Amino acid sequence: PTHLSVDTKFKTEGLCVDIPGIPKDMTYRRLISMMGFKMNYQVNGYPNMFITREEAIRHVRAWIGFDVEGCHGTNLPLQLGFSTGVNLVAVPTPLMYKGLPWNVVRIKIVQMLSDTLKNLSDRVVFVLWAHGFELTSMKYFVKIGPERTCCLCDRRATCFSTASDTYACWHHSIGFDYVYNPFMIDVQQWGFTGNLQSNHDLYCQVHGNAHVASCDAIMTRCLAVHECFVKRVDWTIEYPIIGDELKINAACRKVQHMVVKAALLADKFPVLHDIGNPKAIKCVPQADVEWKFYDAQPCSDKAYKIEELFYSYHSDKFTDGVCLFWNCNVDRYPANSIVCRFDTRVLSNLNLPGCDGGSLYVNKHAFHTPAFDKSAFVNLKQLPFFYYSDSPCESHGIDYVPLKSATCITRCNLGGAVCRHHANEYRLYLDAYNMMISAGFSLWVYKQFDTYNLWNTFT
Ligand SMILES: [Zn+2]
Ligand SMILES: [Zn+2]
Ligand SMILES: [Zn+2]
């Protein structure tokens, strides 16, 4: 039960305005045949063009919304819309391209998908709200067959060239003219009432309808992300390493230890309220403080209301000591907080566009994150960069130019000359910090926080 049986029934009601007379009784097998493709009873790794919801969720990085609108069916021009914002007009002879034959339109489709997907995924999943013209247009830019490898590398083939008769992955496809063995899913098969816009607009106010194909493509993918990652959540699903996941995750643990250790040293809070992941461990295990944990899963829909987290009656006195919100997204942080908050607006290979201004951050697991909101931090200030160490100045065991920095908070810098060990550790910490910030994480702290208070923790 891993792949979608071609003998599964497909509901055709959504197709019958573009394809009048379409049979009510329809399988994937007969739909694929109707789309002009032949599957030849092939056991060669491509059992169906269409995939299950579970398979689609495992391949979220591959998702490309796709819509086709009648522009005036072989007689008339077609507007091809993609969740990339691209609109192409194909003639049978926000970006909006003038009408051109299929032989040149297919070249632009391969370039667009290859540049979008090469750093994300080994495939494409076309996310549909299928009404018929999108399915009958696939024969003009898709070829299918056995699973293949790239002509220049070991990656599976995603593109075909009629010029050279060869196959390529997204990395090696320059000049290629056909999409090869795409996948697709029709969201309309999931059991909705009413049209795309009415279902999309229940959950999201950020994607409008300009009545162009790319708008529908964007709304379709947005609705699918809502259904699979907002209303439903699965943190058991692991996703492949495609980038700096491991360095980012390590940097996060190092920065969290540094910042909390320094806040406790600087302001000597008697209690810390650690609000968020129910799996969280003490990030500063040697600290003197009373460490109290409060369980909150990562919110995927709306930021938590601080009133619901804290009130309904716990130390209960969250105004005592300091509150730690490490990726615990709330509408408004209390004044006595240490905060790490993911900025959903960040461009990266890990951060995919999401629902209602939220983003889908995929790093080992998929986390749909509510829209970044600057107003959440009104009681706090941005945490400045600093490095603190009480460790002995001792090298042990890479070449040196002497470090000069006001933000190297060590005995040796207090003494007027940074030692090689603390210089090496500072530069490693600065790289880790810049990695985590570049990844989209933002750091906020209570307004009284002052690194000047750390110098007297050496005497
Ligand atoms: Zn390749
Ligand atoms: Zn939306
Ligand atoms: Zn030192």
Side-chain angles (χ1 to χ4, degrees), residues 1-71 73-74 76-313 316 318-397 399-459:
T2 199
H3 290 112
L4 176 65
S5 173
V6 297
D7 295 314
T8 306
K9 290 295 171 66
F10 181 96
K11 180 185 187 159
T12 52
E13 184 166 329
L15 268 44
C16 79
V17 167
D18 292 0
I19 314 177
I22 188 157
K24 182 174 175 284
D25 177 38
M26 178 74 50
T27 60
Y28 286 95
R29 184 190 302 274
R30 186 184 182 87
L31 185 69
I32 291 167
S33 165
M34 180 187 151
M35 287 163 60
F37 297 94
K38 185 150 188 171
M39 306 268 282
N40 283 166
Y41 318 96
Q42 165 255 98
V43 282
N44 292 153
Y46 192 69
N48 196 341
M49 300 180 73
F50 291 80
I51 62 167
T52 69
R53 209 159 157 169
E54 303 62 42
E55 198 166 334
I57 287 166
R58 288 190 291 99
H59 299 289
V60 69
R61 287 164 174 164
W63 288 10
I64 301 286
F66 177 52
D67 187 54
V68 172
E69 296 303 334
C71 221
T74 332
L76 47 79
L78 292 171
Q79 182 185 60
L80 281 51
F82 307 86
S83 56
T84 60
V86 176
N87 298 277
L88 310 175
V89 176
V91 299
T93 186
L95 280 317
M96 289 273 294
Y97 296 88
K98 289 200 74 177
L100 284 170
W102 274 108
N103 48 305
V104 309
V105 166
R106 62 178 63 112
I107 300 161
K108 176 56 186 186
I109 297 172
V110 168
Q111 167 272 299
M112 185 195 72
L113 296 176
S114 298
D115 291 345
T116 298
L117 292 176
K118 58 194 191 190
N119 297 317
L120 292 195
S121 170
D122 64 348
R123 64 195 68 209
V124 58
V125 176
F126 291 128
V127 191
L128 318 174
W129 185 274
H131 54 258
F133 289 145
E134 72 293 279
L135 291 182
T136 62
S137 82
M138 281 185 182
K139 72 177 77 79
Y140 299 117
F141 67 98
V142 170
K143 289 288 176 60
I144 74 165
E147 283 289 276
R148 285 162 183 283
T149 75
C150 182
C151 70
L152 286 173
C153 80
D154 283 350
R155 297 180 184 92
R156 90 182 265 282
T158 58
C159 312
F160 173 76
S161 179
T162 61
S164 58
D165 210 56
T166 60
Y167 298 88
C169 74
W170 298 132
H171 294 278
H172 296 118
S173 74
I174 182 153
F176 280 51
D177 60 340
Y178 278 84
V179 183
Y180 184 75
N181 280 17
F183 307 91
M184 50 209 75
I185 189 165
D186 173 25
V187 166
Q188 215 167 1
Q189 300 302 301
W190 297 357
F192 291 94
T193 304
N195 65 10
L196 174 55
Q197 171 144 19
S198 74
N199 282 285
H200 167 275
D201 286 1
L202 285 186
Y203 310 121
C204 175
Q205 321 310 330
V206 163
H207 304 121
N209 188 2
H211 304 87
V212 8
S214 66
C215 298
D216 298 331
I218 293 178
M219 284 200 283
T220 300
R221 188 189 158 280
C222 174
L223 181 56
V225 174
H226 182 272
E227 295 300 286
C228 297
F229 298 94
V230 175
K231 71 161 301 206
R232 175 248 302 292
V233 178
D234 193 347
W235 299 307
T236 69
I237 297 161
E238 208 94 31
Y239 291 87
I241 301 306
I242 57 161
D244 289 312
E245 285 96 317
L246 299 179
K247 279 181 206 298
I248 293 162
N249 296 352
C252 283
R253 289 178 287 262
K254 284 228 311 173
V255 176
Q256 185 191 25
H257 173 76
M258 179 72 70
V259 166
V260 174
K261 171 174 170 155
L264 290 170
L265 289 174
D267 290 285
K268 307 173 173 58
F269 297 106
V271 53
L272 183 142
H273 312 274
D274 200 341
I275 305 127
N277 198 253
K279 314 305 300 132
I281 292 276
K282 285 205 199 185
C283 58
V284 190
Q286 305 286 277
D288 216 354
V289 71
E290 177 169 39
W291 209 293
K292 305 183 175 212
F293 290 103
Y294 306 84
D295 301 351
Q297 296 293 10
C299 55
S300 77
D301 193 346
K302 285 298 95 223
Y304 289 118
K305 293 173 221 159
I306 190 67
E307 315 315 332
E308 59 185 358
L309 281 188
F310 279 9
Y311 314 129
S312 304
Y313 188 48
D316 263 346
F318 292 102
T319 60
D320 293 331
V322 69
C323 295
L324 177 61
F325 299 88
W326 200 268
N327 299 319
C328 185
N329 309 323
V330 323
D331 57 354
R332 181 144 297 170
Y333 297 97
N336 60 331
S337 302
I338 302 168
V339 176
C340 179
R341 175 48 154 110
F342 188 69
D343 187 350
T344 53
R345 309 171 294 175
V346 65
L347 286 130
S348 79
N349 298 149
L350 302 180
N351 197 38
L352 302 173
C355 181
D356 196 29
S359 75
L360 189 61
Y361 177 63
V362 188
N363 181 330
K364 300 172 56 55
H365 305 288
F367 308 94
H368 190 274
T369 303
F372 185 84
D373 174 19
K374 300 190 183 184
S375 75
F377 313 107
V378 293
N379 300 323
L380 305 177
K381 67 180 176 184
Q382 300 173 355
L383 174 71
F385 173 77
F386 71 92
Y387 167 81
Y388 174 88
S389 185
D390 46 356
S391 77
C393 308
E394 244 290 83
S395 262
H396 273 216
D399 269 43
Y400 190 47
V401 154
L403 177 62
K404 305 190 202 312
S405 174
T407 55
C408 185
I409 316 190
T410 57
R411 253 179 315 266
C412 45
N413 207 16
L414 182 62
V418 177
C419 74
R420 194 163 302 176
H421 167 74
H422 283 126
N424 294 346
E425 290 297 302
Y426 172 102
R427 282 165 175 149
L428 288 177
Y429 182 76
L430 180 54
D431 288 345
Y433 196 90
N434 290 324
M435 171 78 57
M436 183 219 250
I437 297 295
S438 79
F441 296 99
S442 63
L443 291 165
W444 311 76
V445 74
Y446 54 94
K447 281 172 173 167
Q448 300 82 3
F449 177 76
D450 186 359
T451 60
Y452 190 63
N453 293 141
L454 296 167
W455 297 105
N456 274 124
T457 69
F458 339 110
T459 46

